[PDB]
Amino acid sequence: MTISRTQQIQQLEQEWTSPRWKNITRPYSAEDVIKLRGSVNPECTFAQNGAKKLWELLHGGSRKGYINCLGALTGGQALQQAKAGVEAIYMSGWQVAADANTASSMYPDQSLYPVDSVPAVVKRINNSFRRADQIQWSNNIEPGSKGYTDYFLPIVADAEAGFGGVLNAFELMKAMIEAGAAGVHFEDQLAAVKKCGHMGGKVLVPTQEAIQKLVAARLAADVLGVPTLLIARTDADAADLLTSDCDPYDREFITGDRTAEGFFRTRAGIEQAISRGLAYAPYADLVWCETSTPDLALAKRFADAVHAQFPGKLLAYNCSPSFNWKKNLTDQQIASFQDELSAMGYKYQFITLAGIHSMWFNMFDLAHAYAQGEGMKHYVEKVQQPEFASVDRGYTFASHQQEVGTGYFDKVTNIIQGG
Amino acid sequence: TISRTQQIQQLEQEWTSPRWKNITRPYSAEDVIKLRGSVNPECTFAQNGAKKLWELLHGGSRKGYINCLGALTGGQALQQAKAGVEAIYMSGWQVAADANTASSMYPDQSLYPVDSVPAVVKRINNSFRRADQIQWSNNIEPGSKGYTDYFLPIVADAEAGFGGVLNAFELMKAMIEAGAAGVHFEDQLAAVKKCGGKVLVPTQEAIQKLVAARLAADVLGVPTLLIARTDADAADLLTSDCDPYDREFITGDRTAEGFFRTRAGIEQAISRGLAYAPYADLVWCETSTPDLALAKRFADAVHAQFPGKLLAYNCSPSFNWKKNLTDQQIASFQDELSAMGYKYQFITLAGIHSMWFNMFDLAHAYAQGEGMKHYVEKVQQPEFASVDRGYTFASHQQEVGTGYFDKVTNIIQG
Amino acid sequence: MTISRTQQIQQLEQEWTSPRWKNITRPYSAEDVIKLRGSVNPECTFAQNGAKKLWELLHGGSRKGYINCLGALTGGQALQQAKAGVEAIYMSGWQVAADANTASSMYPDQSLYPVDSVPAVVKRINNSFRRADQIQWSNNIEPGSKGYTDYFLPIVADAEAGFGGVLNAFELMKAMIEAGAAGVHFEDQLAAVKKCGHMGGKVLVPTQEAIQKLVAARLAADVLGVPTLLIARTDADAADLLTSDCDPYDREFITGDRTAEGFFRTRAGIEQAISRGLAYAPYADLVWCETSTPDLALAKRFADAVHAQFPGKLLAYNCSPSFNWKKNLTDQQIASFQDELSAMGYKYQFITLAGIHSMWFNMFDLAHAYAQGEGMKHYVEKVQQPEFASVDRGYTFASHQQEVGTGYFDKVTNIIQGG
Amino acid sequence: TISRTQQIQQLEQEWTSPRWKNITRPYSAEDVIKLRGSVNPECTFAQNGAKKLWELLHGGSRKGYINCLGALTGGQALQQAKAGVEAIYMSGWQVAADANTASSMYPDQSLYPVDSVPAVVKRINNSFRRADQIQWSNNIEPGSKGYTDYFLPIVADAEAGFGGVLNAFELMKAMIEAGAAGVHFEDQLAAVKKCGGKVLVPTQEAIQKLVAARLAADVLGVPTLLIARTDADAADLLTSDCDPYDREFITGDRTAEGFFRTRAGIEQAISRGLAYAPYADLVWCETSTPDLALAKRFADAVHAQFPGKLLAYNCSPSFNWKKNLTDQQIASFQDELSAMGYKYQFITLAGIHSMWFNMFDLAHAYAQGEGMKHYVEKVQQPEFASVDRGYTFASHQQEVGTGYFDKVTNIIQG
């Protein structure tokens, strides 16, 4: 049955009454969304599937009661995470800046790479998943059977602050969805003006401007018709600078001091972060207070404050890869950290830079020994034997040709050529 | 002002230098200049890489041979440089699997777009460039305490050139423009790999691909290393019997496809190696089974006709070393190859195994729970313990250029 | 309702009994196709719509009884064709080689550019159509109303000979479909070995090898589940060389002479082309005899021979942009040429290089005058005034800001910002 | 061997050359060398382009001014070269519309990815390169009958640098690496264009972007032309009042967004032009309405403080020339601008209008029927008639390199 424009509007209005959209504010109409959709709205299968799966995982479907992730910067890394039992992929903008962007360059984390970069790697990941799934399906290995992997993990992707204005955010959100992201995060700092020096640091935008970026992102998702998870990050815990005092909501944090650039000094900390989290909560599915120092007490303060106004709100938490865990916490505290966060409502947790540290450290570790001599000894000891020892854990890449689809394409060849 | 006569004379003179001893070119200097245009953009990375690689192969390597590990990201290559590695190997198999411009995962059958390997070569040189910018910005120059020469020569896989002689010509140019120091071409045709085995092209066609590649390098004016790979050790099929040189290996039997069956093995490999030697700077017999006896046979045969010829050797990442060789043999393997004249050695898939295994290893424990314990035990603490070995990435912000760009910002802002 | 693997096979078997697939041979099973599909088969909306529309146009839906096309090398060129009333886009590999490939280089037509190039431009075209449609929809301009354009023209794309082996063809076909092509053509020459010199020229592959490329392409489309039009081109009219004599079907054309490369000389001409067309007909939706010299008599011979075995078979015809039409044909013959071809069953006709000649000639024409002086006089006379004079023909680009979506994005901005 | 002291001295010396008269740099030679690294890859196209453009602007142009037409493909640029044009204009609006790396159609609001304009600059230089290879392969060199210098300098649109000073710095480097001869930056912020009008940034922030760009060029060691565009003629909004220099134009009124209302017009444009002059090689007052009187006002004011300053001027493709000016005024317009010191003039959207109109024109007739009649009348016959003007593309195979690659094939095959 053909679906008329009026029917599209009605169906959208109906969808917004479903449990998925409970407590979510949209400052525009269904009619407005359909006005932007065009007469043909190409389907985004990976994004639809990812968003639905991520929602399920966030609400009781996960194995541990929370989702824990590790930043992946190649499709193959993501694939190994799936094989290993990880339930969702974290896609880090920092890692993409460093070693996987479309400028083919190494950058620090300041929104320097071209805006198509993160969507490009999301696509890479979904293609690795797709080939792995094709291999599995071609051998009729089914869910519940030994050796089965559900390869299509939802991908949560870093959109920075949207690379400019509301339209840049709108376009980037669409690109994430088209690439197949399940969730996307936006933050309220402006990387472009990050202040250099000892009295520098991150700079926030007014709350109203951060809210408008979230509205732009939700609009993009609504126009495409995909219930993508939207995560609002605040940098207000550490950021003691603000571009403009134009939003009265921010006034209580302004100290009066200005920078040479004209920025306003603010009182950074948990209170400012709470202010931002409360403001963003109606416009996002999850709220995230960026933290450089893992601290359960502060995590509890943030969660309690948000939940006092927004009971049950889903929260995200980044677990620092640079914080010296052993030096600052007991082994018991380290082992229980993510569990403890989960009980507070942090249901999406991640180590942003895990993949790049994993890759870079282990490349170094092998290379340093190998370069000195007895090369094969070191390859065998550091790589080949440990691989063999992981077969019982579900590692399959010792069988390298099948892993990348040699058997799959042999089947294709055979089907083409007959027999 | 350099007239054409002058350019031709200059090229003819260059070909008399030590670099070109025993190398055959079936075309003229005039031919090369004809293709050059009036403007020839400089390829700095490729010039530096080719010169450095030649030096390493003639007395410059620490161990007397160069040993490499396939890298598939710029950051992997950078960490190898930090670790003391002298050259980078750039694997087509790894690019097919996890680093190509189709953004897809492929087996090793020339399925990815032809710009893929050059794209990763470019990535690597950019990682090297930033690392060098970082040290230089902190007053570290060649000769300074703490200086690392980050610009390792890169040797890159061109497969069989992705079609005909012009495809090989274009791919070679793209490798050089991206900054490769050396490039290898092989004599199998992936497109018709039988479900079966590998299929060779006639010797004359493989030579034509080598000629195409050398011509590209000559036109650009870069002394890129050219490596000739033969797949004749295992390939027992041949597309055509048109080259009388291949006659002795043909059995007479033909497949349904029309291929010619051949007697695969060390003798066919030797035949190909001898044929390619006059065109290439190194020859390589692709081997699936590490075997010093066969390596000695190949080297002996080549060196009987081409004394001192540089040889390359691939050390299999899938062969079960411990099961089939003693620990002593494993430890001495690359050294023993060197004594036979194998001066460029590499593990093609080292980088992808390194990356994929360790990702799995961390992820599997992390997914079970106690997540931070596993990150600390498997990654953070081992990083800390490698600081004395020269590992610097625990200082993660400086590593990727945060300090460098801070300096840029400060200079702009005054 | 969830669709099981068995149901997917049954549905495919059922689809192959429909009118779309009458007279089409597949040397593999539905079970084999599903084996390669994976558990998730992402939707290709533009390709589905394009393929269905192209089939309709080919069977009575076109305005003139045949579809006539002009090679387009930018999305904007394709957009102007749609505005002008053209019903399908031709996507030329020659034009892509010259001025629109992913190597960013200028190449002759010898399969030198990277294999992702033609899909990349197909994507560009569909995105231009998409934005134009979004603009139209946002202003509620509907079919049948004045000023309405159905922007989503089916795109027919040049896949050369698939860039290698059967798997390269398989992958390229998938890339075309994912980009949104409605139809794709493959040819039976091997560009890689095109013989240089006066006694050189195009080289054919054995008929069986050309058939296998068509099977590979159909398999790809079947796996993706899109009824993409498949066009088999033969180069046998002019090609008097053949790579191998291994197919007994080709024996009658072999002369006995060999080249230095080992190629076999053949008797080129209409008979060899007919042989190839007859062989490919069961494995393609259209057959195309590449022609350098427009000749109605030869076109009739080819059509009659194909139709003697395959009544009603759809045929394609390329109309040479380099042939000197006025010198060789009367004005009456020139004006009626495409009409006459249509009556013979050539329902898809195209000038491969029209877009590049259009672009390059007119850039030259303006530049040559402009460079000499009185610059604005020449811009006004050659461009601006002629544009104004075309408004009544439906040309809208004098209103340049709206054309590219300024009004559309203003609506987006307004919706985001409220009001 | 060139020490840092030597490199710094060399740079300091270069800044004393005629090229750098009246140019202000708020940073030191030491600062520049600090960012350069130990290896600085050559950018041949950018070096040649910048030198040639400087020559054209100081006595080399045929007419005493350079006039340009925006090009959005390499082939368009090549045809301009064939037609006698002296330089290429590279429009961001056209890239947004029909030639960006997002493969999408956008309005002119900095929506495309930042690598887009450099990508098309690369395409253009490659078209130029092949055209030159073709002529050279046929024994046509500078001085030969039939020689064309295909390597026209390219002036490219960098918008407002896509974010902060580091984004501008990186974009400038990418322009140079692709081979641009000149680059322009503007003082509006597209991201917040009000639905309303254009919005300016403070003068100091626009200057910082110019400094960032010059620094990038200095670090790479290329004397790229830097053009400062102001949008202050039409922009009546300002993001911030932080620069006291902008005070006189601020009205006091503020918008809901927090912007400052300003008095737009020629005086605000003059203010910006005077402020940017010490940093840029040319200044440009963006104009929507061709008006010689206003052009004279802007030029007069700038030249009163900066005698001889090179000016650029955009000639609107949408202004209704015939309706508003006499044919005589239209014909003399660019010449009259030249007398005022506007030495770089361009129609930004000429290429896209040329391409899109003529595609429509052919398609509309062709779709109606009698298809070949229309192709012959609109394209083929007009091409034939332009052979005496230097149009060569009727010979379509040679134009794109068929003869060149035939020569390559023949050389490889012997």
Structure tokens at A266: 């603010």
Nearby residues of C43 by Cβ (< 8 Å), 6 or more positions away? A42, A43, A45
CA distance D4 to D30: 9
> By CB neighbour count within 10 A (0-12 exposed, 13-18 middle, 19+ buried), where does C315 fall?
buried
What 3-state class would DSSP assign to B186? strand
**Is D315 marked within a binding site?**
yes
Domain containing residue C281: CATH number? 3.20.20.60
B280, B228 Cβ separation under 8 angstroms: yes
Least CB–CB distance from A133: residue in C38, C167, C212: C38
* Contact between chains at C376 and D108 (C-beta distance less than 8 A): no
B316 annotated among ligand-binding-site residues: yes
Q: Rounded distance, CA B25 to CA B215, Å?
A: 8
Of A70, A73, A127, the CB nearest to B362: A70
Number of domains in chain D: 1
**D143: CB partners within 8 A, 6+ apart:** none
Between β-strands D199-200 and D225-230, what pairing exists: parallel, antiparallel or unpaired?
A: unpaired
Comparing CB atoms, the residue among A111, A114, A163 nearest residue D115 is A114
**Rg, C-alpha atoms of chain B:** 23
Burial class (CB in 10 A: 0-12, 13-18, 19+), A84: buried
Retrieve residue A366's tokens. Answer: 């092998």
A129-132: list long-range contacts, CB under 8 Å, 24+ apart. Answer: A129/A75, A129/A78, A129/A79, A129/A82, A129/A153, A130/C38, A130/C40, A130/C42, A131/A404, A131/A405, A131/A408, A131/B104, A131/B105, A131/B106, A132/A79, A132/A82, A132/B105
B206, two tokens: 């493989």
* Nearest chain A residue (CA) to C36: A138
Element (DSSP H or E) covering residue D163:
none
Contact yes or no for C101/C151 (Cβ under 8 A): no
Matching residue, tokens 């796996």? C223
Q: Is D242 annotated as a binding residue?
A: no
In one letter, which amino acid is D402?
Answer: T
Q: Which residue of C has its CA nearest to A215?
A: C416
Pick from C278, C348, C303, C281: nearest CA to C24: C281
Order of strands across the sheet that contains B237-238? B199-200, B237-238, B260-262, B250-254
Contact B352 A76 (CB under 8 A): yes
CA-wise closest residue to C26 among C308, C309, C287, C284: C284
Displacement of CA B333 from its chain's centroid (Å):
20
Residue C110 to residue B166, Cβ atoms within 8 A: yes
Q: Strand pairing partners for C349?
A: C68, C317
Amino acid at C392: D
Which one of B103, B349, B359 has the shortest CB-CB distance to A123?
B103
Which residues are registered as beta bridge partners of C287?
A: C232, C315
CA angle A307, A311, A312 (to 5 degrees): 100
Burial class (CB in 10 A: 0-12, 13-18, 19+), B359: buried
Which of A168, A213, A259, A264 should one mutate to test binding to chain D, selecting the residue with the greatest count of D CBs within 10 A?
Answer: A168
Pairing of strands B342-347, A254-258: unpaired
DSSP lists the bridge partners of residue B345 as: B67, B313
D278 annotated among ligand-binding-site residues: no
Indicate if the alpha-carbon torsion angle D77, D83, D89, D92 is positive or negative: negative
- Taking the mean position of all CA atoms in its chain, how far away is CA C57? 14
Task: List the beta strands (DSSP E) in C93-238.
Answer: 155-158, 183-187, 203-204, 229-234
8 Å CB contact between D181 and D90: no
The answer to whether the CB of D319 falls within 8 A of the CB of D288 is: yes
Q: CA-nearest residue of chain B to D143?
A: B3
A378 alpha carbon, distance to own chain's centre: 35
Q: Are D338 and C296 in contact (CB under 8 A)?
A: no
Of all residues in chain D, what percent are helix, strand and coil, respectively (each to 5)? 50, 15, 35
Amino acid identity at C403 = E
Instruction: Return d(Cα C52, Cα C50) in angstroms, integer.
Output: 6
- Which chain B positions have a beta carbon within 8 Å of D172's beta carbon? none
Q: Report the candidate in B185, B175, B184 with the shortest Cα–Cα distance to residue B217.
A: B175
Chain D interface, Cβ < 8 Å to A: 101-102, 109-111, 113-115, 162-167, 170, 174, 190-192, 202, 240, 242, 257-258
Closest partner residue to B411 (CB to CB) among D141, D215, D409 is: D215
Residues of B in contact with A99 (CB under 8 A): 73-75, 127, 400
Q: Cα A98 vs. chain centroid, distance in angstroms?
A: 16
Q: Tell me the angle at which helices D165-178 and D44-55 cross, rounded to the nearest 10 degrees.
A: 90
d(CA B162, CA B189): 9
**Cβ neighbours of residue B310 closer than 8 Å, sequence gap 6 or more:** B57, B281, B282, B283, B341, B343, B344
Cβ–Cβ under 8 Å, residues C361 and D391: yes
User: What number of CA atoms fall less than 13 Å from residue C317's CA on the CB side?
Assistant: 28
**Which residues in chain C have their CB less than 8 angstroms from residue A36's CB?**
134, 138, 408, 411-412, 415
| Residues in B touching C163 (Cβ below 8 Å) | 162-163
Chains B, D: CB contacts under 8 A, how many?
Answer: 107
End-to-end CA distance of chain D: 43
Domain residue limits at B129: 1-414
User: Two tokens at C296?
Assistant: 């109605």
The nearest alpha carbon in chain A to B349 belongs to A400
Q: State the catalytic residues of A.
A: 196
- Residues of B50-75 as b/e, b for ≥16 C-beta within 10 angstroms? bebbbebbeeebebebbbbbbbbbbb
In terms of Cα–Cα distance, which of A204, A155, A197, A191 is closest to A51?
A155
- Examine the residue annotation and report whether C246 is marked as an active-site residue of this protein: no
Distance CA A68, CA A336 (A): 13
Q: Are C193 and C243 in contact (CB under 8 A)?
A: yes
Beta bridge partners of C348: C67, C316
**Site of tokens 């802007």:** D298
Torsion (CA) C255, C256, C257, C260 in degrees, nearest 10: 130
